[PDB]
């Protein structure tokens, strides 16, 4: 089997930058090399076929190059909608084989999150569990510290975070932090607070509610 | 317009087998080879095999000769792929693709089909409102304690799209999934519309609308 190596699997680039994604085959593949784009939602598109030909409807800032074992996908000037994982595929021999992929991280200017906190509903509480959600909306870069404080006591070990993929329009992230407590623990405390530290914020932002 | 409509997510038992369909349309089904591709979570694409629909002739990646069977039905214009003796290594997204002759490439791809292989039982999500106890207002729904992936979430049956973030699921220490879907609205545009999240968990046949009450 021909192995397709994409050594760089995570690549950052600024909007407007020239971006190069490389692929090497274990042996010569005679230009029988296609490029695919997979968006964060799992949809796949053909970009380039036979090393260099644009697929119908693909913008012209995309080009393909190389021969023998070494191939490149170049994006002449990065657009926000280019956030994706890029894959090579040889069709010189069966079985068809794919590189490991290269994921783009788009670098844009700093944007601080806006922050929201949500108390648990009675509909949830009545079943024995409180989920408290803190939302960080439309920020860059990815790095953010989210600290939960209950009656001003710093919490540890009782929250989980999730982050969206970079937005295809504004290249930002959004993040949820969820604090899980038993109903009985939820009801022993008054003030639920999430404190957010980020490069876009000149000092930490705190959002809170009072139960009862 | 060429379209490849794959069948829905599927939970299936270790040792069981599962059939996936790829309903095609916008092109003569018989005039194009169909290939299948696997993608394990956080991983790259693996070619499984291709089928000539016109005469049913098949080509398999040797790694899948014991796993996969590709067949067609020329009448419904539908390709099928059956995976047998499933283990948790079969847990993946499966794609169907069309081959174009130009110089060969996979020019159209299905949306993919998530197969989970597990002993654990299906479980529908509970859906709870996220409402505040400023320039913009936020609300959402918490989609809690479901198995397996995936859920889909929409707002006002697809009419509300911008400001929407549906977070990826986290595996909880219970082995159940949970996620939140939020929307932000500029304060001024808040009190026009109502806000209802529509949550679909196909593996459990759960469909749940939750109206998130704006406070009075």
Chain A environment of B102 (Cβ under 8 Å) = 49-50, 53
Do A84 and A119 have their domain in common?
A: no
**Residue B216 counted as domain residue:** no
Do B111 and B42 have their domain in common?
A: yes
Do B97 and B132 have their domain in common?
A: no
Q: How was this structure determined?
A: X-ray
Please state whether beta strands B164-166 and B196-201 pair in parallel, antiparallel, or not at all (unpaired): unpaired
Handedness of CA B32, B38, B44, B50 (dihedral sign): negative
Do A73 and A127 have their domain in common?
A: no
Q: Which two tokens stand for residue A98?
A: 């794919």
Is any Cβ of chain B less than 8 angstroms from the Cβ of A126? no
Which residues, numbered 1 to 30 in chain B, qualify as contacts with chain A under a Cβ-Cβ cut-off of 8 Å? none
Q: Which of A52, A73, A107 is the last residue of a domain?
A: A107
Do A73 and A142 have their domain in common?
A: no
- Alpha-carbon distance of A119 to B129, in angstroms, equals 9
- C-alpha to C-alpha distances, B171 to A71, A173, B145, B147, nearest whole angstrom: 38, 21, 9, 9
Q: Which two tokens stand for residue B59?
A: 């080509």
Q: Which residues pair with A161 in a beta bridge?
A: A177
* Closest residue, chain A, to B212 (C-alpha): A121
Do A124 and A157 have their domain in common?
A: yes
Do A76 and A145 have their domain in common?
A: no
- Alpha-carbon distance of B152 to B132, in angstroms, equals 23
Q: Which two tokens stand for residue A194?
A: 């999430």
- Alpha-carbon distance of B110 to B93, in angstroms, equals 11
Is any Cβ of chain B less than 8 angstroms from the Cβ of A120? yes
Per the CB < 8 A criterion, the answer to whether B210 and B127 are in contact is yes
Do B108 and B136 have their domain in common?
A: no
Task: Give the domain extent around A33.
Answer: 4-107
Is any Cβ of chain A less than 8 angstroms from the Cβ of B124? no
Do B102 and B152 have their domain in common?
A: no
Q: Which of A90, A107, A124 is the last residue of a domain?
A: A107
* Closest residue, chain B, to A35 (C-alpha): B105
Q: Which residues pair with B196 in a beta bridge?
A: B211
Total count of residues recorded for chain A = 212
Domain of B69, CATH number, reads 2.60.40.10
Sheet strands (E) in A91-167: 97-98, 102-107, 114-118, 129-139, 145-150, 153-154, 159-163
Do A26 and A90 have their domain in common?
A: yes
- C-alpha to C-alpha distances, B1 to A97, B29, B101, nearest whole angstrom: 28, 13, 18
Do B54 and B86 have their domain in common?
A: yes
Q: Which residues pair with A206 in a beta bridge?
A: A195
Q: Which residue has the tokens 């394990």?
A: B40
Q: Which of B91, B117, B143 is the last residue of a domain?
A: B117
Q: What angle do CA B116, B120, B122 make, to 5 degrees?
A: 75
- Alpha-carbon distance of A100 to A6, in angstroms, equals 6
Cβ contacts below 8 Å, chain A against chain B, sum to 132
Number of structural domains chain B divides into: 2
Do B15 and B48 have their domain in common?
A: yes
């Amino acid at each position: 089997d021909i192995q397709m190596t994409q050594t760089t699997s995570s690549l950052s680039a600024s909007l407007g930058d020239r971006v190069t994604i490389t692929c090497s085959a274990s042996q010569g593949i005679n230009n029988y090399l296609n490029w695919y784009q997979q968006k964060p939602d799992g949809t796949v598109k053909l970009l380039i076929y036979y090393t260099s030909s644009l697929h119908s409807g693909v913008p012209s800032r995309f080009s393909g190059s190389g021969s023998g074992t070494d191939y490149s996908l170049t994006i002449s000037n990065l657009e926000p909608e280019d956030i994706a994982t890029y894959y090579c595929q040889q069709y010189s021999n069966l079985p068809y084989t794919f590189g490991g992929g290269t994921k783009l991280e788009i670098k844009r200017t700093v944007a601080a999150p806006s922050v929201f906190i949500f108390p648990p509903s009675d509909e949830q509480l009545k079943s024995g569990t409180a989920s408290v959600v803190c939302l960080l909306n439309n920020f860059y870069p990815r790095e953010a510290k989210v600290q939960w404080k209950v009656d001003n006591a710093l919490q540890s070990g009782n929250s989980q975070e999730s982050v969206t993929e970079q937005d295809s329009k504004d290249s930002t992230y959004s993040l949820s932090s969820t604090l899980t407590l038993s109903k009985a623990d939820y009801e022993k405390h008054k003030v639920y607070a999430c404190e957010v530290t980020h490069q876009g914020l000149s000092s930490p932002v705190t959002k809170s509610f009072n139960r009862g | 317009e060429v379209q490849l409509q794959q069948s829905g997510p599927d939970l299936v038992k270790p040792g069981a087998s599962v059939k996936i369909s790829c309903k095609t349309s916008g092109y003569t089904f018989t005039e194009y080879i169909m290939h299948w591709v696997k993608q394990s979570h956080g991983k790259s694409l693996e070619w499984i095999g291709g089928i000539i629909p016109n005469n049913g002739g098949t080509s398999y990646n040797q790694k899948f000769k014991d796993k996969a069977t590709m067949t067609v039905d020329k009448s419904s214009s539908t390709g099928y792929m059956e995976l047998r003796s499933l283990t948790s290594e079969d847990s993946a997204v499966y794609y169907c693709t069309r081959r174009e002759v130009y110089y060969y490439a996979l020019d159209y791809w299905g949306q993919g089909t998530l197969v989970t292989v597990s002993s654990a039982s299906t479980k529908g999500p509970s859906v709870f409102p996220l409402a505040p106890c400023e320039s913009t207002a936020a609300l959402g729904c918490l989609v809690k304690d479901y198995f397996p992936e995936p859920v889909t979430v929409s707002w006002n049956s697809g009419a509300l799209t911008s400001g929407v973030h549906t977070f990826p699921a986290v595996l909880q220490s219970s082995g159940l999934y949970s996620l939140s879907s939020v929307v932000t609205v500029p304060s001024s545009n808040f009190g026009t519309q109502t806000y209802t999240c529509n949550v679909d968990h196909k593996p459990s046949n759960t469909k749940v609308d939750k109206t998130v009450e704006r406070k009075c």
